[PDB]
Amino acid sequence: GSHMFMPSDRSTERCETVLEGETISCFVVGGEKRLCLPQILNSVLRDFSLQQINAVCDELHIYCSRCTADQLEILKVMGILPFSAPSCGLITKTDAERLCNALLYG
C-alpha cells in the first residue's frame, strides 16, 4: 500500500476549455487547467511543424508535463487518446494560449 506514506491526491475527473476555437480536454492541477498536448497538436496547430512548435515553446519557456497514470486512463476513457497511447503530455492553459498566439498570429 502507498496510502500509509501520505500520497497526494490524484486526478479523478476531467474538464475542458476552448482554445482558438477547439474544445480541449484538461485536468485542473495546482489551480490551473492542464491541456492535452496531443489534442492541441492535432487540431489548432495541426498545420505547424513540430520543429517550429518546439522552437517557440522553448523561447516561451513552456514546460510540458506528463500525464499521470490516472490522467492517461481518463483521457482514454473519454476517447481523446487511443487505448494504446503510451503516454501524453500536458501544457498549462496560459502557456497554450501564448503558444497558439505566437504561432497563429504575428
Swiss-Prot record:
Disease: Shprintzen-Goldberg craniosynostosis syndrome: A very rare syndrome characterized by a marfanoid habitus, craniosynostosis, characteristic dysmorphic facial features, skeletal and cardiovascular abnormalities, intellectual disability, developmental delay and learning disabilities.
Protein name: Ski oncogene
Localization per record: Nucleus
Family of the protein in this entry: Belongs to the SKI family.
Described function: May play a role in terminal differentiation of skeletal muscle cells but not in the determination of cells to the myogenic lineage. Functions as a repressor of TGF-beta signaling.
Subunit structure and binding partners: Interacts with SMAD2, SMAD3 and SMAD4. Interacts with HIPK2. Part of a complex with HIPK2 and SMAD1/2/3. Interacts with PRDM16 and SMAD3; the interaction with PRDM16 promotes the recruitment SMAD3-HDAC1 complex on the promoter of TGF-beta target genes.
PTM note: Ubiquitinated by ARK2C, promoting proteasomal degradation, leading to enhance the BMP-Smad signaling.
Name of the coding gene: SKI
Domain of life: Eukaryota
Disulfide bonds: none
